[PDB]
Design an enzyme around this catalytic site. Structure first.
Site, PDB file in Angstrom:
ATOM      1  N   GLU A  71       0.806  -1.219   0.000  1.00  0.00           N
ATOM      2  CA  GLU A  71       0.000   0.000   0.000  1.00  0.00           C
ATOM      3  C   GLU A  71       0.840   1.270   0.000  1.00  0.00           C
ATOM      4  O   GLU A  71       2.018   1.272   0.383  1.00  0.00           O
ATOM      5  CB  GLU A  71      -0.904   0.160   1.244  1.00  0.00           C
ATOM      6  N   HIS A 100     -10.437   3.641   3.645  1.00  0.00           N
ATOM      7  CA  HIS A 100      -9.910   2.784   4.771  1.00  0.00           C
ATOM      8  C   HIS A 100      -9.964   1.286   4.704  1.00  0.00           C
ATOM      9  O   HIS A 100     -10.177   0.573   5.717  1.00  0.00           O
ATOM     10  CB  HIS A 100     -10.594   3.246   6.130  1.00  0.00           C
TER      11      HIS A 100
END
Length: 108
Positions: A71, A100
């Site tokens: 990520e 999220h």
């Protein structure tokens, strides 16, 4: 600073690495980054958090033996981190999340 979904998406697939405005959380910590204080732009001007391994424990991203997911933060400039993330595999599948890591959609 290449910190947009398209910019980072296109950089990865070409260069097979994040642009240089990224640092991992352990690197950021080592410079005085305190998550609870939102001070990253103070200790690491122009940097964004990116490059750590994303576990994919919940099977939301497509798994494959030998595919590692990482990520990177998108659209960050200062303060507390946002909810934007690019997800990129070892074989350069590119997904995005705006909430999220609850949901992902393919971008590359």
């Amino acid at each position: 600073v290449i910190n947009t979904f398209d910019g980072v998406a296109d950089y990865l697939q070409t260069y097979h690495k994040l642009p240089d405005n990224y640092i991992t959380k352990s690197e950021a910590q080592a410079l005085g980054w305190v998550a609870s204080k939102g001070n990253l732009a103070d200790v690491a001007p122009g940097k964004s958090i990116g490059g750590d391994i994303f576990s994919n424990r919940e099977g939301k991203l497509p798994g494959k033996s030998g595919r590692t997911w990482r990520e990177a933060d998108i659209n960050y400039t200062s303060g507390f981190r946002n909810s934007d993330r690019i997800l990129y595999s070892s074989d350069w599948l590119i997904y995005k999340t705006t909430d999220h890591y609850q949901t992902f959609t393919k971008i590359r």
